[PDB]
Design an enzyme around this catalytic site. Structure first.
Site, PDB file in Angstrom:
ATOM      1  N   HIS B  89      71.514  50.268  57.395  1.00 49.22           N
ATOM      2  CA  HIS B  89      71.595  48.827  57.648  1.00 49.22           C
ATOM      3  C   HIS B  89      72.144  48.497  59.034  1.00 49.22           C
ATOM      4  O   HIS B  89      71.746  47.497  59.649  1.00 49.22           O
ATOM      5  CB  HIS B  89      72.438  48.160  56.555  1.00 49.22           C
ATOM      6  CG  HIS B  89      71.980  48.510  55.178  1.00 49.22           C
ATOM      7  ND1 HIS B  89      70.788  48.050  54.652  1.00 49.22           N
ATOM      8  CD2 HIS B  89      72.522  49.319  54.236  1.00 49.22           C
ATOM      9  CE1 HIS B  89      70.627  48.548  53.437  1.00 49.22           C
ATOM     10  NE2 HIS B  89      71.669  49.313  53.158  1.00 49.22           N
ATOM     11  N   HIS B 225      68.748  45.920  50.458  1.00 46.84           N
ATOM     12  CA  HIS B 225      67.569  46.503  49.817  1.00 46.84           C
ATOM     13  C   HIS B 225      66.906  45.403  49.003  1.00 46.84           C
ATOM     14  O   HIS B 225      67.480  44.923  48.024  1.00 46.84           O
ATOM     15  CB  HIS B 225      67.949  47.704  48.931  1.00 46.84           C
ATOM     16  CG  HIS B 225      68.570  48.829  49.695  1.00 46.84           C
ATOM     17  ND1 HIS B 225      67.824  49.813  50.313  1.00 46.84           N
ATOM     18  CD2 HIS B 225      69.866  49.104  49.980  1.00 46.84           C
ATOM     19  CE1 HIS B 225      68.637  50.652  50.934  1.00 46.84           C
ATOM     20  NE2 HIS B 225      69.879  50.248  50.741  1.00 46.84           N
TER      21      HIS B 225
HETATM   22  C1  LIG Z   1      71.462  58.673  50.004  1.00 48.55           C
HETATM   23  C2  LIG Z   1      72.764  58.147  49.552  1.00 48.55           C
HETATM   24  C3  LIG Z   1      73.341  59.070  48.533  1.00 48.55           C
HETATM   25  S1  LIG Z   1      73.856  58.208  51.028  1.00 48.55           S
HETATM   26  C4  LIG Z   1      73.511  56.448  51.387  1.00 48.55           C
HETATM   27  C5  LIG Z   1      74.839  55.773  51.486  1.00 48.55           C
HETATM   28  S2  LIG Z   1      74.852  54.482  50.279  1.00 48.55           S
HETATM   29  C6  LIG Z   1      73.049  54.494  50.126  1.00 48.55           C
HETATM   30  C7  LIG Z   1      72.521  53.625  51.264  1.00 48.55           C
HETATM   31  S3  LIG Z   1      72.972  51.885  51.107  1.00 48.55           S
HETATM   32  N1  LIG Z   1      72.708  55.887  50.355  1.00 48.55           N
HETATM   33  C8  LIG Z   1      72.773  56.655  49.144  1.00 48.55           C
HETATM   34  C9  LIG Z   1      71.558  56.411  48.264  1.00 48.55           C
HETATM   35  O1  LIG Z   1      70.688  55.614  48.712  1.00 48.55           O
HETATM   36  O2  LIG Z   1      71.629  57.020  47.204  1.00 48.55           O
HETATM   37 ZN   LIG Z   2      75.199  51.655  51.797  1.00 48.74          ZN
HETATM   38 ZN   LIG Z   3      71.465  50.944  51.943  1.00 45.08          ZN
END
Ligand SMILES: CC1(C)S[C@@H]2CS[C@@H](CS)N2[C@H]1C(=O)O
Ligand SMILES: [Zn+2]
Ligand SMILES: [Zn+2]
Ligand SMILES: CC1(C)S[C@@H]2CS[C@@H](CS)N2[C@H]1C(=O)O
Ligand SMILES: CC1(C)S[C@@H]2CS[C@@H](CS)N2[C@H]1C(=O)O
Ligand SMILES: CC1(C)S[C@@H]2CS[C@@H](CS)N2[C@H]1C(=O)O
Ligand SMILES: [Zn+2]
Ligand SMILES: [Zn+2]
Ligand SMILES: [Zn+2]
Ligand SMILES: [Zn+2]
Ligand SMILES: [Zn+2]
Ligand SMILES: [Zn+2]
Lengths: 267, 267, 267, 267
Positions: B89, B225
């Site tokens: 983001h 998202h």
């Molecule tokens: C890949 C991740 C485990 S690490 C990353 C930090 S929180 C989310 C994106 S908002 N994102 C997790 C996710 O989308 O599961």
């Molecule tokens: Zn995040």
């Molecule tokens: Zn995210």
């Protein structure tokens, strides 16, 4: 018309750069404790330890293991010094600061690049970023730092990065002084050398840096990439047998640089 | 015994997160200009533009293209606001600041994480780093920022990150006011929720955040998202037809959170 | 035995350094808008304004008043450049960034000193601190920055501070080009010159800097302290009549420096 | 019409705030080592020392003298913790980091204010700046830090500053545990309390903070200004005899706060 933007690409390196090795003694207080093809020098004093370079980001735990093997606990690590603040030499600095007592001393150029995590590189853009870290002390050209009586002198040698630094100190071996010179890279891998808007005096700085390296106090030369000074860390008792002098290292680098200039003009 | 340390792994994402889309109008001054599955909101005023989120690091040029298509030059971009400072983001924020007139406003938590390039994440360590950037203005909970008469209010909703923020503002559509709520993620993907030494009041903060999101002024909800609020950016004139209310979004997130707590206790 | 530690002492200056003056035109786009004895140069272009130096911290509102008088609103100020990051030249930079659209470009040395608010000065310790500010762009020696077609070139002239910079640009007057050189201080007020552990190559840098200043493109010289170049801002239409050439400025500074070296050796 | 801008005004304080005192023991490992009217707590462990607050900027050498008297060398100081990052409590932190092995742990709010050297204060603007310092570790509400087995717990109590923190730990005296609470200021000196655009939830935060302080584990209360908790550091063996409970401290502060609100409404 259905084409997504490309995925981020990780900074990947030859396997040997990531191959752990046991500590290899260079002189009475000085050890190579990095990987087979990335230098990380541990200097052990009665008054704490100094680390010069850490290699790649994923090397932090290995370094801590080797320090422990040497009798150096996280609290004993006092100081981190750097050749230059690219990902393959300053990579684990942020994590080492979090996990040890270590503080970082560096010149202003290396400090701001380190603080950016190597982003917005003059030549590589954001292609080689790593965790950012803050410098605790800013050093000037020729300034000394003393730890447990080992005296480290900074010699700026701008070129490979604006903040590229050689570090020199005097250790002992067999009762005799050994003037060690840890000289930075003198390479310019894929760089635009002439008329670079981000580095207009690049060529003049490299030339000055060849002269600086040539004149270092230098019984023993080491470099961030050991191959650059003809070290073979995997060769045990003969690891440093073929090592270049500082003069030979500088001459080789200048010859290569001149070739690169000529090819750039042609290319 | 010949096993090198692993290569760095790049932060890779579903293709749709990186699929460029043309600007999609939300209200009279508010446009989605990111990718099909990552929100980046452009608010255009008589006195310059505001960007809320940028998506992934490699999206900077796409965003600038869409701004240009909207009549917004690099100099016209005045302000960048963030939901939270994760790589998907806040990724291109450093580059956008370099390439535009934009300054960043964020709370202290988001500022320090942004300044670290997302390194030393409470949950993900150094797995999701991006180019670091500095905040130009630090905002407090409930503080307003006004650009060209559009008034943005910060509503802290700590949890997904300590600095997670909802931003609200009032736009128009068909002569009638439209209270837009850009609410941050309420997910906790793979997080240790209970007894987390790095975030001891994590659960209490999430609970407070569900209540905050539920009560936002919210004619129209958008999320970083889009799927989280049931937006479908690829669905054109019906992109927002199925969008959740802020109340429904908060309720869904809390139910999921409660399930995750129960599974953690069992797991 | 009842003696408290001393009170903090404020950085106080001659009244004339703090005496506001109306804008004084230097060339078609270039104005002095600081005080009678501190330079702050406004360069106005069709594509925004540039400020070179701000003077003392308490001068921010005065500068903004003079900008307004010139037709420059807070949003129109695009760039701040600095001679060196001492309190009497970079003083109001933090506040100007907060109150305008201005971003700061500076070399690494000036950036780290600015980011410290001038604390831990090589010579003055914490005696002359001011609000810290961050640089948005790091410039290299000889690098150019272009705003609305006016091209500014950086010329490093380390000495008074490690990051001391001359800025040059070409303006017009009477249809003819006017090469303006804003050269930094070449003074070393109360400095330890020889064998300074915090600045070991101080003397070599000053000598190089005299040579740099001597060779600048320089139809018109201006300095951060106007008296140093024999400007009299209060003298109206004859304010610049007695101005030194860059050559004369450098020669005078070197003579003074040599005298100071000789007195230091004697003292 | 000949009136210069005013001189910078130094942050001056009552003499007693700057009156050095010898170390005064609070419990088996905990000492007051600041001045007669500014708290600076030294906690000595088998595995290094912790300093909580440093007082004013000019107190650095005095603190180091008292540490030395206690058997603590510059290398032994491991950690600096802060109540809040105003000049009269965090003043010498930058210098202490330069002169010792100490690293700083603080919450995000205190870290960004510390990194600004206290400039752009929500209430005092640039009136009370001090040398900026960087935090080495960011702590969350309720997070613990352990040094030589003494466990320090952070309790956020936002109000006097956004980052105001109470620190609690358990020491011993006469074989019995002593739960020490170092609670931050609960004053709001000259603050705009209601409708403050820079701190919209100021009143709600203070109220929450009174409740937090009231409930701390608190055999012994200490405060950054000793008078606030009825400590008299100059009274030797009876220095802490009249000390308030945490409950009484919170109640007194809330009563005063309510009075101030009523006067603000009238004023
Ligand atoms: C890949 C991740 C485990 S690490 C990353 C930090 S929180 C989310 C994106 S908002 N994102 C997790 C996710 O989308 O599961
Ligand atoms: Zn995040
Ligand atoms: Zn995210
Ligand atoms: C891969 C690179 C093109 S990017 C990285 C920066 S300089 C060198 C590591 S010292 N390295 C170059 C190299 O090794 O060719
Ligand atoms: C007062 C000082 C000794 S401290 C301050 C730093 S250099 C010069 C301002 S350019 N100034 C010196 C001076 O003007 O003498
Ligand atoms: C002098 C001040 C108005 S400014 C400074 C910030 S809060 C308090 C020190 S804790 N101090 C206020 C005070 O002591 O009244
Ligand atoms: Zn490199
Ligand atoms: Zn390398
Ligand atoms: Zn100066
Ligand atoms: Zn000056
Ligand atoms: Zn205070
Ligand atoms: Zn105070």
């Amino acid at each position: 018309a259905e084409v997504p933007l490309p995925q981020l690409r990780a900074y990947t390196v030859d396997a040997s750069w990531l191959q752990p090795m046991a500590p290899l003694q260079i002189a009475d207080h000085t050890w190579q404790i990095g990987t087979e093809d990335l230098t990380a020098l541990l200097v052990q004093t009665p008054d704490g330890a100094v680390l010069l370079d850490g290699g790649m980001p994923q090397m932090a735990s290995h370094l801590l293991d080797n320090m422990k093997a040497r009798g150096v606990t996280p609290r004993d690590l006092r100081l981190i010094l750097l050749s230059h603040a690219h990902a393959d030499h300053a990579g684990p600095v942020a994590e080492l600061k979090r996990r040890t007592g270590a503080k970082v001393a560096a010149n202003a150029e290396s400090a701001v690049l380190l603080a950016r995590g190597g982003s917005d590189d003059l030549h590589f853009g954001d292609g080689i970023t790593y965790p950012p870290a803050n410098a605790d002390r800013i050093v000037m050209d020729g300034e000394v730092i003393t730890v447990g009586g080992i005296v480290f002198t900074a010699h700026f040698m701008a070129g490979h990065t604006p903040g590229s630094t050689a570090w020199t100190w005097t250790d002992t071996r067999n009762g005799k002084p050994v003037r060690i010179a840890y000289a930075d890279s003198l390479s310019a891998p894929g760089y635009q050398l002439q008329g670079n808007p981000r580095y207009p005096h690049l060529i003049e700085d490299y030339r000055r840096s060849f002269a600086t390296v040539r004149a270092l106090p230098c019984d023993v030369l080491l470099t961030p990439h050991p191959g650059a000074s003809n070290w073979d860390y995997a060769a045990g008792a003969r690891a440093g047998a073929k090592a270049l002098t500082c003069k030979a290292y500088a001459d080789a680098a200048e010859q290569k640089f001149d070739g690169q200039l000529a090819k750039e003009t042609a290319g």
